[PDB]
């Protein structure tokens, strides 16, 4: 009902309190984590962080989950701000498919010691020594043929 004021290094943002209470796990949504950023002489929270990056972090609270990125802020700077505001690994993974970089695929294992030795030995030639030695001979068999 009441509103909060957030002061990102001189730039003032004002949202209602219940908007931050949608995600009660993050930094802004948890009333014991942000209590060390309060400023009782101005009745606001002061963060000495990046200015144009918080406009996208605020939209994630209002839209209910959409993580965008402005053109100005790079990838290595916007990624730290998700880590600082503790938006979560589901919010962090939304920065992947928004940007386009797909997640790594987990490979299954044959749950043994014999077959788990030989699966990573030929399918993954960058694993061991003769794994690189099985690739240098696998190029010859097709090339002679």
């Amino acid at each position: 009902g009441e509103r909060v004021v957030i002061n990102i290094s001189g730039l003032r943002f004002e949202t209602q309190l219940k908007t931050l209470c949608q995600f009660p796990e993050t930094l802004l949504g948890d009333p014991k984590r942000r209590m060390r950023y309060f400023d009782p002489l101005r009745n606001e929270y002061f963060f000495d962080r990046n200015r144009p990056s918080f406009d996208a972090i605020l939209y994630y609270y209002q839209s209910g989950g959409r993580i965008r990125r402005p053109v100005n802020v790079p990838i290595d700077i916007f990624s730290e701000e998700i880590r600082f505001y503790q938006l979560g690994e589901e919010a962090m993974e939304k920065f992947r498919e928004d940007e386009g970089f797909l997640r790594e695929e987990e490979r299954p294992l044959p749950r043994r010691d014999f077959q788990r030795q030989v699966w990573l030995l030929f399918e993954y030639p960058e694993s061991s020594g003769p794994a690189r030695g099985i690739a240098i001979v696998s190029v010859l068999v097709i090339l002679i043929s």
């Binding site: 990838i75 290595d76 990624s79 730290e80 880590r83 962090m92 920065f95 992947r96 940007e99 970089f101």
Partner: peptide, 10 residues
């Protein structure tokens, strides 16, 4: 993935 995932997953 030399610039992207170097500071994405963490």
């Amino acid at each position: 993935e030399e610039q992207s995932q170097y500071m994405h997953v963490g």
